[PDB]
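PROTOCOL LOG
Step 1. Enter all chains and additional molecules of the complex.
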Amino acid sequence: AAKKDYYAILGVPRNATQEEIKRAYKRLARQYHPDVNKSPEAEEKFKEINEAYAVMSDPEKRRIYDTYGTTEAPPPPPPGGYDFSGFDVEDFSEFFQELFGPGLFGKGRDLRAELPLTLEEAFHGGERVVEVAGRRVSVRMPPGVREGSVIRVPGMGGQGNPPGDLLLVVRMLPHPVFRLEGQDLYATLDVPAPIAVVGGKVRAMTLEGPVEVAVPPRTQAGRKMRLKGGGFPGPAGRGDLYLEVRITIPERLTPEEEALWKKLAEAYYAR
Amino acid sequence: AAKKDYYAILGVPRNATQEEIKRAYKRLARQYHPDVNKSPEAEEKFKEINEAYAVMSDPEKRRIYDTYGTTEAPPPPPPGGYDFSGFDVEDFSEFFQELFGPGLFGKGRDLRAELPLTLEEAFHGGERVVEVAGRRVSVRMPPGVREGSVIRVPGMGGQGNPPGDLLLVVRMLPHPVFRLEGQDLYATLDVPAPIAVVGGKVRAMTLEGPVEVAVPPRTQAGRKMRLKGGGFPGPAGRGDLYLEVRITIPERLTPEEEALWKKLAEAYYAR
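Step 2. Run joint prediction.
Step 3. Record the structure below.
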């Protein structure tokens, strides 16, 4: 209740410098430290010294204390609260609690947020700047990150003593062409009917870019083709790419091309 | 309330034999039977005879009727109760309800079972014979009956006064070709590539039978074609059939056919 004299406790004058306070703390802390001084009186003196230094080491906190009493009631807290890092704040005197209490909060809560990513964003990974309701955060993201993968950004959660963690959970945006299942990718490969019969090379697509795919002679619709290592990356191994063959036909032709298609069609009505 | 004379209703002497009661029932049952006698008076008379015979036919039940009213040893109804299977017990008089009431069981438990049906079986509906627990049961069935549909067969449940009900739930067996969704049907239509380009007729399938489906010129794979009313029937409406076009190519060809396919293929590598 009664205003503690932190200056008397550290044995420094009312107008001491910060370094004067620092060295006074060092001198007195080594004097009353639990494992150097095994006295019952030393426990309380050490506690006092730590409380004194906790307030006086910060110029901002030192000023609050200096201008307390003339203005009777405790002052409004700063945004966020008071930061007494490396100080057992719960063990300090009642005077302290009355004075700094309004801005002494408990363990900060974690914030859990979704990280909506496109197949190619998650595939590459790398550095992503994330703005999720509250703060701007940059994080490293492993190549081939999946749905429900947790990215912990420590200290970026809720405000408190200490602050909480940001927990980002990856969500996968549906893709126009590819379909993810585990580490494997699945896509439809359009193969022109003549190329399917004879067997040639079609231009297909991967997330890395476009590749050439050789289709064997007489490959039917629904034939699944594996491109080893063309799927999602992973720590222990890489997934594959599966292309499902989809026979395609020309929606437009030249009068010359009609003659060829007509002969085949007639041979089908024959069979 | 008053003691009914069952001997007077059946037309038998006070000390008749069990065979004499049986033949007197047959004589009077065929005289006042529902479908042979269309009289309003025959309704009560036939109910009277049914009440009499039910009591009189069983020697244990008949003795109970004979020894009722007198100031002798008062017998509580037997541990097993009274068996009146095949008689509208509640419909009977109160005199019957007072003497046999304590030995009667309540309405029987419902028997619950699954009715596994194929798409074609569910499509057509009608009369079905089913085995549940031990017995066979006939059951009418609406065309286009669906998954989870309840078919209450009254009086075909557990033993009781009256018996309970059979409750069947329709389960749909998976089909090799058709897929049900609501009342709509879905299936894959194989279409030879040359027919898809030029446009012609393909032999498609329904649950009724096979049909001809006219395919327009230049119809791409994935084109979905509605066959009105070709789906599942129902009250107030009929489902559609949807056939998804799947372009097919020949797995075997003639040396003459190779040349036609080879030309188009080389015109595609050129494109």
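Step 4. Note key features.
The domain at 173-271 of chain A is CATH 2.60.260.20 (HSP40/DNAj peptide-binding domain).
The interface with chain B takes residues 192-198, 200-201, 218, 220-222, 246-253, 257-258, 260-265, 267-269 of chain A (CB under 8 Å).
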